[PDB]
Structure formats: structure tokens, C-alpha cells
Amino acid sequence: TNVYADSFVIRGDEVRQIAPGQTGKIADYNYKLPDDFTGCVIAWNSNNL
Amino acid sequence: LSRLDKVEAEVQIDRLITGRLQSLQTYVTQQLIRAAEIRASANLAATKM
């Protein structure tokens, strides 16, 4: 029905926090996913940019 | 609910819900059968009255 594309940059050690039910500085205070999340998480190393 | 975070708690709670619901189904099933036995004695007692 709709699609929402969210984008941001974080540390490699923080990528593991971008999932439903996760915790930590990023998941808790920056970007929280719902427990019944229905989307996809895509991430790549950007140390070149 | 005090000890675990939600997405882990739901796994533990659903075990209790499963087993406690299975406990009520066992109780009500056996009470329905006992009720049928008491009905038979009640119909007999009424006939002897």
C-alpha cells in the first residue's frame, strides 16, 4: 500500500542494532524499529565516502 | 515480565499460555464428562421419585 525508505549513517558496530527488538544507543535513542517490523534493512561500508 | 525484554518474554509467556490453556481444556473436558454422569444419576433419582 505504501513504502517508506529511511537512510542514515552509523558505525559498523552499530549495524547489529538496526533490527526489531534490539537495544543500544542507536536502537534506544536514535532509530527504533517496531517489534512487528515488516521491512528490510540494507547496509554497506561507506569508509570510501 | 520483570526479567526479560519483550521479544524474549513473548516466547516464555506463550509457553505458559499454551500450558495453562491446555490445563483449562483438560479440566472443562473432564467436568463435561462428569456432568453427563451426574445428569444420569439425576434422571434416575427423578424417575425413582
From Swiss-Prot, chain A:
Domain of life assignment = Viruses
Query: Which region ranges are annotated with the description Integrin-binding motif?
Result: 11-13
- Outline the subunit composition: Binds to host ACE2. RBD also interacts with the N-linked glycan on 'Asn-90' of ACE2. Cleavage of S generates a polybasic C-terminal sequence on S1 that binds to host Neuropilin-1 (NRP1) and Neuropilin-2 (NRP2) receptors. Interacts with host integrin alpha-5/beta-1 (ITGA5:ITGB1) and with ACE2 in complex with integrin alpha-5/beta-1 (ITGA5:ITGB1). May interact via cytoplasmic c-terminus with M protein. May interact (via N-terminus) with host bilirubin and biliverdin, thereby preventing antibody binding to the SARS-CoV-2 spike NTD via an allosteric mechanism.
Functional summary from the UniProt entry: Attaches the virion to the cell membrane by interacting with host receptor, initiating the infection. The major receptor is host ACE2. When S2/S2' has been cleaved, binding to the receptor triggers direct fusion at the cell membrane. When S2/S2' has not been cleaved, binding to the receptor results in internalization of the virus by endocytosis using host TFRC and GRM2 and leading to fusion of the virion membrane with the host endosomal membrane. Alternatively, may use NRP1/NRP2 and integrin as entry receptors.
Task: Return the protein name.
Answer: Spike protein S1
Q: Which organism is it from?
A: Severe acute respiratory syndrome coronavirus 2
UniProtKB/Swiss-Prot annotation, chain B:
Q: Taxonomically, which superkingdom?
A: Viruses
Task: State what changing T47I does.
Answer: In strain: Gamma/P.1
Q: What does this protein do?
A: Subunit of the fusion protein that is processed upon entry into the host cell. Mediates fusion of the virion and cellular membranes by functioning as a class I viral fusion protein. Contains a viral fusion peptide that is unmasked after S2 cleavage. This cleavage can occur at the cell membrane by host TMPRSS2 or during endocytosis by host CSTL. In either case, this triggers an extensive and irreversible conformational change that leads to fusion of the viral envelope with the cellular cytoplasmic membrane, releasing viral genomic RNA into the host cell cytoplasm.
Q: What is this protein called?
A: Spike protein S2'
